[PDB]
């Protein structure tokens, strides 16, 4: 392909750097050391996180103005529609994105007015739109894993041991308590890995060593991206060691968010919204936003779980050079609508836009030439994956979406 036009873009972005959501007794008990405190209330976007999102917004601006999808200077109000989930961290991310892609332009983000309820676009199962069946969910998650959860200790032996050494787990209150019971302090096996669906089927949670290690690995990465001086007690260094440690986090997201029998239910509203916005089908099912015919970019301010759900539904898999989290802070799953001017056949392309560990930690100015954001084209399962942009035919893509959705989970 050559000479195709970029007609429209949807950005499903993760929020930027946040403080940890929770500090449980388990998280304190698995290390003798003290977790460093954060300058912002639990779960909120940090000011540094906003600055990093704004830097990414400036890159998105340079990139799409180079393409021409965005004109020079301030975008209009019809050009960009930005919708955020109800969390503070997503709402502020959305505004910091606009401040970077349209600096001093006074663009405004939109969100569900009732902040005391989840937004079913981003959390339809939690919202009660559709329910998970526990029996089915245990069966199909084991099928995706390819064995019982007890195999995780062996599949991830080295990263689990690596995490225990970072935590100094052998000297921790939890280990001391295990030794009181005559058990050993094998961090990979400190407890069973367990999946629990709640009684109404509105929540599914993994707990145990993989879940904890995914949480703590993300915290270390957030510490690093926040530019904290002491990351993981200075016991985590080397890009090789970051990649292996965060493989626990990525594996947890694969199992609990990319498995289609969970992803289908949690991700159907977002997938319908992405699809209908990309082709600008303004009154199709799943198109809930007041999009103009002139819409050029739809920004969706969501979570790593949302990105992973969409990836599981579409069969997307990627690895990010110099970014060990597959769903990193402020990273965007970007959908492009490309059109052939000769016949007006359209195509869908998917890219993961992200900042590297150094780009985050050093708050680096991004630019098209010298220091661009990372951009990874992503192959789509069942798609034609044509050329450098891995293009999928519009009709092929719509067929895949139709097969992937759980239609009872629409809004």
Numbering used by the authors: 8 to 418
Q: Which statements did the authors publish about this structure?
A:
The phytase APPA derived from Yersinia intermedia exhibits exceptional overall properties, including a high specific activity (3960 U/mg), excellent pH stability within the range of pH 2.5 to 10.0, and resistance to pepsin and trypsin digestion at 37 °C for 2 h, making it highly suitable for application in the feed industry. However, the issue of heat resistance has emerged as a critical bottleneck hindering the industrial application of phytase due to the technical requirement of instantaneous high temperatures during feed pelletizing processes.
Through combining and superimposing these mutations, the optimal variant APPAmut9 was selected, which exhibited a cumulative presence of additional five pairs of disulfide bonds and six single mutation sites distantly located from the catalytic pocket. APPAmut9 exhibited a T50 value of 96 °C, representing a substantial increase of 40.9 °C compared to APPAmut4. Notably, the variant APPAmut9 exhibited a remarkable enhancement in thermostability without significant alterations in both Km and kcat values compared to those of APPAmut4, suggesting an unaltered catalytic efficiency. Superimposition analysis revealed a structural similarity between APPAmut4 and APPAmut9, with only a slight deviation of 0.53 Å observed for 409 Cα atoms. Through analysis of the mutation sites in the crystal structure, it was observed that the introduction of 10 cysteines effectively facilitated the formation of additional five pairs of disulfide bonds within the crystal structure of APPAmut9 (C147/C268, C271/C413, C353/C401, C101/C116, and C57/C103), each exhibiting distinct electron density. These covalent disulfide bonds establish crucial connections between diverse secondary structures such as α-helix and its surrounding α-helix, β-sheet, or loops, thereby ensuring robust structural stability of APPAmut9. Furthermore, the substitution of glutamate with leucine at position 282 in APPAmut4 results in the formation of additional hydrophobic interactions between Leu282 and Val408 on an adjacent α-helix, while maintaining three pairs of previously observed hydrogen bond interactions. The substitution of Arg382 with Ile382 resulted in a reduction in the average B-factor value at this location (22.1 A2 versus 17.4 A2), leading to the stabilization of the β-sheet structure.
